[PDB]
């Protein structure tokens, strides 16, 4: 599958693409306000992310520091990335289908819409100023606007034993962004696609 990464912030992103124990495709790399990157995310790939990085610095192989949205130091992510991160989350060719999601379970750093670029479904964004408004209790000094699980390490946050209700942090994330999983078992915004759909993932769409 083809995954088109359109950055159109108007600061540089550190694109990453992992499913948690491997990269997909080469794992990450610089986007420049403008610039495309296109990957080959391989079918049956389950429990894939694409986020943002903001603020990184890498030395010549490739290892260096990120501000949000760091994996283990490396320019090509194997791992996920450090909280907050928005998430472009999706599992492709699961029983004919593919599925696609925003979350905020992790965060917040760049805005995003997460699209087809093939027939058959809509796409997901969430492009609304979540660092801007974000509750003061939240803020990452490091950047960004963090999930309440990240800060406050509860069960309840965290929905650790599965059972969990929504939140004064979780309702912030949802209301800014209604079509983004807010908490772990927030009514999904899970979208259905043909599977082997091909996708675009675009940083700052209205931004
Ligand atoms: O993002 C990490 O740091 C990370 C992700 C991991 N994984 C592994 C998967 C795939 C299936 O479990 N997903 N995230 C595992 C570990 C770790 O053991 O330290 N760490
Ligand atoms: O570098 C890692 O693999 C790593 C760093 C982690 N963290 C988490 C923090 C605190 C705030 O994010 N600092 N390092 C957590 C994990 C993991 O759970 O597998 N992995
Ligand atoms: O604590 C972690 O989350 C962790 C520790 C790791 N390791 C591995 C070693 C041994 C030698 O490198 N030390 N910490 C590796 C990872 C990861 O890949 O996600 N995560
Ligand atoms: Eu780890």
Do not use: H
């Not at 049956?44 to 949000?68: E, L, M, P």
């Not at 379970?105 to 660092?131: E, H, L, W, Y």
Request: with cysteine; hydrophobic share 30%.
């Amino acid at each position: 599958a083809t995954f088109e990464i359109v950055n159109r912030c108007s600061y540089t992103v550190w694109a990453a693409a992992s499913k948690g124990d491997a990269a997909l495709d080469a794992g990450g790399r610089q986007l420049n306000s403008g610039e495309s990157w296109t990957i080959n995310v391989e079918p049956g790939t389950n429990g894939g992310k694409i986020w943002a990085r903001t603020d990184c610095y890498f030395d010549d192989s490739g290892s260096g520091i990120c501000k949000t949205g760091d994996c283990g130091g490396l320019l090509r992510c194997k791992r996920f990335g450090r909280p907050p991160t928005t998430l472009a989350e999706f599992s492709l060719n699961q029983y004919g289908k593919d599925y696609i999601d925003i979350s905020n379970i992790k965060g917040f750093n760049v805005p995003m819409n997460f699209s087809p670029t093939t027939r058959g479904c809509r796409g997901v964004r969430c492009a609304a100023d979540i660092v801007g408004q974000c509750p003061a209790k939240l803020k990452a000094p490091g950047g960004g606007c963090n999930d309440a699980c990240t800060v406050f390490q509860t069960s309840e946050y965290c929905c650790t034993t599965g059972k969990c209700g929504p939140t004064e942090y979780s309702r912030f994330f949802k209301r800014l962004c209604p079509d983004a999983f807010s908490y772990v078992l927030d009514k999904p915004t899970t979208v259905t696609c043909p599977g082997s759909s091909n996708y675009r993932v675009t940083f700052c769409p209205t931004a």
